[PDB]
Design a protein around this ligand. Structure first.
Ligand SMILES: O=C(Nc1cncc2ccccc12)[C@@H]1COc2ccc(Cl)cc21
Ligand SMILES: O=C(Nc1cncc2ccccc12)[C@@H]1COc2ccc(Cl)cc21
Ligand SMILES: [Cl-]
Ligand SMILES: [Cl-]
Lengths: 305, 306
């Protein structure tokens, strides 16, 4: 019993974190095989950040300008290149702790674990979701750039996020490991803002199924709804539309609890129109949207890595 | 910016998790140097659990009755002893991945990270707190016994909890790494129940200081209170009494934000009376009590967002 916001065990990623220094700037790097990946803004001064020409700033650097530290050992940079918004530093030593891995681009609504780092040292691990507006609600201070987000599939680590910046509302923006930003953001000190966010409907439904599995049933009702009527309600409350794909994905949870997806949608509709009336669900007075259907099945079944 | 429930990186603990088997029972063990620590109830059958006599059950076992598996390698047990509710199995190989460590007994209100394991394999990591009734609100299924709780302040792992059982309300009970239970619980299947739980007041205050550091002041008021008047009101909402020790511990957060502890206590009294009125604090519609004063200082910026 119990339901917690749970992250993947971080050990396989901790053995890949290194410190990257270029001039006065220090940030984190990810060391896989003989390459260190880090945000390309490591080569910038604060004035360069106003309007940077990264190819131009980079041509002025040599291999020895990049200091890479792995624990207490200094790594030797033997090459450097840029791919989108990521800098790739070729080093002479392959990481003996390199896990089995993949680089994956995730979609909004998908969750991942973040290993927050400072000076190449891991400080904490937390779970979060790619919001529909492509930002993440992380917890990051100055020095956290280069911290990574990941999932573990079987024994393979899938790297999906690298941290680059904080927006004025305190939310965060970054790239996949191929350097492509999530969202309409750019790595430049210029006016940028997070767009209006929405709630991840399929994830709220998954969390309601987790509450039922844990013995919380006060919100259940005898009613059902159509997908079209539910989507008209969900639009009124700034909830993402629910598709037939989402309904199919919730199938196993629907069969386990005996509550059809559109039956749970009728509970969600009543919660949106009336509130919780002083009650809580899994210790929360708000509807939680940062657990996917897969996260719910994984936690309620004890899958190991 | 941001404020998240954050766990310590689990790598140092993952390299210690092993699987322990005795007959038909399988659970998790913690391998440090040449000793594997696990709950003593691994020697019990389900029928033994009502009134087990662990000394009588253990004297009947030999070293080769305990199967210890570390990854794909079978470890050899060369000795066994019991200390309180923990079984200690001496093995013929020291763990090469043993971190710098300590065994610490924590007090109610303290937080720690839990590495949930099944069959000696880690499945997830989450942040927990020792409730005032000595239970923990964990997420554990059958086979999770032996999973551990820890903190890693600086480079040393301080092990503080080993999981033993689930109570009828779905909450969890366990021991320190010396085998002493937290609370009036026993490793017996006799009728046992968690006492009435209360809210950890010093932790709610710490979390309100985190909200001020991150820029939110909507809940502050022009009032102050005495410590005694605050406690009379707090106990009516099932909040733990706030002691002078708690007031002293909140000193650094008070000095950083410029809000006196008894001034923050007056805001808490008003929140308990009025509720949030459709507002949230750090993304929550409830008052959070699983962040200590130390957790807030570790996670937050040293400069308040004025
Ligand atoms: O956002 C940035 N760093 C930070 C990241 N995460 C958290 C922070 C918290 C506080 C202060 C800085 C934080 C830098 C500063 O301004 C820019 C502009 C563009 C880029 Cl790509 C990167 C940065
Ligand atoms: O509680 C126990 N195991 C579990 C632990 N955590 C979570 C669970 C979830 C589901 C089912 C069992 C879970 C066992 C079964 O009954 C007893 C009685 C006493 C002791 Cl010391 C240990 C146990
Ligand atoms: Cl609501
Ligand atoms: Cl303590």
């Amino acid at each position: 019993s119990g339901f917690r916001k749970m992250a993947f065990p971080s050990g396989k990623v901790e053995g890949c974190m290194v410190q990257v220094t270029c001039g006065t700037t220090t940030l984190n790097g990810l060391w896989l095989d003989d390459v260190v990946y880090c945000p390309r803004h490591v080569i910038c001064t604060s004035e360069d950040m106003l309007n940077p020409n990264y190819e131009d700033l980079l041509i002025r650097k040599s291999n020895h300008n990049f200091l890479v530290q792995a624990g207490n050992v200094q790594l030797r940079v033997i090459g450097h290149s840029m791919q989108n918004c990521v800098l790739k530093l070729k080093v002479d030593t392959a990481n003996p702790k390199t896990p089995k891995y993949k680089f994956v681009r995730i979609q909004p609504g998908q969750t991942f674990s973040v290993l927050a780092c400072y000076n190449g040292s891991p400080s904490g691990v937390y779970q979060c979701a790619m919001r529909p507006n492509f930002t993440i609600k992380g917890s990051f201070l100055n020095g956290s750039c280069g911290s990574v987000g990941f999932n573990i599939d079987y024994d393979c680590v899938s790297f999906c996020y690298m941290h680059h910046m904080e927006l004025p509302t305190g939310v965060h923006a970054g790239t996949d490991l191929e350097g492509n930003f999530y969202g309409p953001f750019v790595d430049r000190q210029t006016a940028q803002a997070a767009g209006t966010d929405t709630t991840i409907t399929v994830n709220v439904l998954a969390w309601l199924y987790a509450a039922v599995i844990n013995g919380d049933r006060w919100f259940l009702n005898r009613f059902t709804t159509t997908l079209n009527d539910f989507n008209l309600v969900a639009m009124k409350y700034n909830y993402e539309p629910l598709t037939q794909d989402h309904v199919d994905i919730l199938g196993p949870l629907s069969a386990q609890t005996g509550i059809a997806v559109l039956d749970m949608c009728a509970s969600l509709k009543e919660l949106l129109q009336n509130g919780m009336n002083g009650r809580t669900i899994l210790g929360s007075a708000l509807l939680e949207d940062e657990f996917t259907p897969f996260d719910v099945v994984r936690q309620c079944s004890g899958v190991t890595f």
